[PDB]
């Protein structure tokens, strides 16, 4: 059934980035709304908000496109799967497109990027490479 809700989150963003939709909508959780903040601070999406659905809450994400039809998100890739968990120390944090990408590292100090978890010296779980 519905396992791995974060890989569904990346999939719903890929399948509407690849179809030039202006916005997505998806069921809400507190881990999705913290990943969506890291996608906003790095400039891969524009502003997201939280609506109110029938049951629970709901997350609605505006996507960003260039002056022409240029994608702002060149890919997405879930890295730590629920069948194979991937953890990384602070001296071998993953390097995504040589530095032009972002890996969403899950540290004890919250969700951080590669650069934010390198100069704070903390490691953790590697959720996804956005780039």
């Amino acid at each position: 059934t519905m396992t791995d809700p974060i890989a569904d989150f990346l999939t719903r963003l890929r399948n509407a980035n690849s179809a030039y939709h202006d916005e997505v909508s998806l069921p809400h959780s507190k881990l999705k709304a913290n990943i969506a903040q890291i996608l906003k601070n790095e400039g891969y999406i524009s502003d997201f908000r939280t609506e109110d659905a029938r049951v629970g809450k709901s997350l609605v994400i505006q996507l960003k496109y260039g002056p022409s039809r240029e994608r702002s998100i060149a890919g997405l890739r879930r890295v730590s799967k629920p069948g194979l968990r991937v953890y990384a120390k602070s001296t071998n944090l993953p390097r995504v497109l040589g530095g032009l990408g972002v890996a969403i590292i899950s540290t004890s100090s919250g969700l951080l990027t590669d650069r934010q978890a390198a100069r704070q010296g903390v490691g953790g779980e590697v959720l996804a490479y956005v780039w």
Partner: protein, 67 residues
Amino acid sequence: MQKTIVVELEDRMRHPLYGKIIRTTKKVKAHDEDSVAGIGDRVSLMETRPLSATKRWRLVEILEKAK
């Protein structure tokens, strides 16, 4: 086993090659000075001198017994 209790430990550990957390179990024989332990029984142990051929542990205390 007449003053001897049998404890099923558990241990989780990375696979050396594939990186998946693997759950494996053991069975150890521990020592009771008084045979009060049913089937269930979250126990706590501490390893000792060799008490028999295969006994190496002792029952320290019992928490949240067989319900």
